[PDB]
Structure 1
Amino acid sequence: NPLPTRFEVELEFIQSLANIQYVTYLLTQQQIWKSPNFKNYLKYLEYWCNPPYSQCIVYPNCLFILKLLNGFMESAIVNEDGLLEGLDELPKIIQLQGPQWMNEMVERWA
């Protein structure tokens, strides 16, 4: 029973972004959007945009959500205290437009 690999763990996490109940759960925790670690991780996960990494993406709306979440990251500013400013209204956006986004991607499914 092998140990997990970085490719497989990062693939599962990047694909979980299609589940936007899951990113609602992630972005309703105060220690995640405030941390610049998550900002830098979501900027790092842009290697799934390009092939051969993009071939393994089974749920490409995760890539859509990844680009949408990284749209706020260049407008993010980290301060000396570690508070990632400009990110207080992102959970507002996610909780307001979550049902709408998943309804639109279900319509794209149909």
Structure 2
Amino acid sequence: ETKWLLSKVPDDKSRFEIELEFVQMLSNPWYLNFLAQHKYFEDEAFLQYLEYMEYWREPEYVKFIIYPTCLHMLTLLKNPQFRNDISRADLSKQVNDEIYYEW
């Protein structure tokens, strides 16, 4: 009824924009660790990942550009539950992407 009113000062046009615009910033394995603070993780943050599920669908899929985001998408699709959203996997995780970058 007034969930938009819950915002301290937001509402915003939102739309497709900053969504994908930050999805490419999700791509970085180095980005993984920072998410181990409070900004978002297993808390209410989990909802972000649970509503960003729409990308596999047609139209949204085209605007994907860096399947490393699709591999971080694999991370959420995988038990990020585990260390993937906890301890995994140091700078080597970037290498785990760099290999994907290598191939």
Q: Is the pair's TM-score, using the shorter chain for normalization, greater than 0.5? A: yes
Q: For structure 2, which runs of at least 5 residues remain unmatched after alignment? A: 1-11
Runs of 4+ in 1 over 4 A off after TM superposition: none
Distance 2:99 2:17 in 1: 28
Q: What displacement does 1:98 show? A: 1.5
Identity of aligned residues (%): 19
Q: What displacement does 1:54 show? A: 0.5
RMSD of aligned Cα (Å): 2.4
For residue 71 of structure 1, what is the aligned residue in structure 2?
A: 78
Identify the structure with bigger relative contact order (alpha carbons < 8 Å, sequence gap 6+). 2
Given candidates 10, 18, 26, the residue that maps to 2:27 is 18
Aligned residue pairs: how many?
91
For residue 59 of structure 1, what is the aligned residue in structure 2?
A: 66
Could you tell me the TM-score, scaled by structure 1's length? 0.65
Q: Any idea what the Cα deviations from partners look like across 1:42-70, whole Å, max 9, x if unmatched?
A: 02111011211010111122022113223
Q: What displacement does 1:23 show? A: 2.4
Q: For structure 1, which runs of at least 5 residues remain unmatched after alignment? A: 77-86
For residue 101 of structure 1, what is the aligned residue in structure 2?
A: 96
Q: Any idea what the Cα deviations from partners look like across 1:56-106, whole Å, max 9, x if unmatched?
A: 111122022113223226xx5xxxxxxxxxx5x332123374233122222
